[PDB]
Design a protein around this nucleic acid. Sequence first.
DNA 1: GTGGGGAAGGGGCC
DNA 2: AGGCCCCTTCCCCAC
Length: 111
Amino acid sequence: FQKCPICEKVIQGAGKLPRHIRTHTGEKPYECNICKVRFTRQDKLKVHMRKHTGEKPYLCQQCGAAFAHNYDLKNHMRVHTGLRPYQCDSCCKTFVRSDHLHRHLKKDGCN
DNA sequence: GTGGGGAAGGGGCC
DNA sequence: AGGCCCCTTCCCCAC
Ligand SMILES: [Zn+2]
Ligand SMILES: [Zn+2]
Ligand SMILES: [Zn+2]
Ligand SMILES: [Zn+2]
């Protein structure tokens, strides 16, 4: 629980305070050594490394399929079970992704 | 108008 | 203080 000196908002996490400040300046200290592409966060560079190496460690437990990223694994999991998990309370329309439900909720015409 | 890919942040655990 | 992973919303796209 720390307060950002710039936008005066509470940021939780001891080490996350420098990272949030990095979003107010646009600096990208981390740079890939192969494609020379600069990133704002280190973990994003780690994902970019997964692209170059070709590693797909996200292995489905039910069927054994391997995927590059986590969201690709999530998209495969809904095929195994729960194709359309979300729903609108008022209109009872099924949705696949949370943002898609918020898309209907952004209109908010049912409420 | 619907699905999805990727981006951009915030947080939890170690 | 930071790596590594998860989650979310949002832009923008082919269909
Ligand atoms: Zn700030
Ligand atoms: Zn690269
Ligand atoms: Zn599977
Ligand atoms: Zn609705």
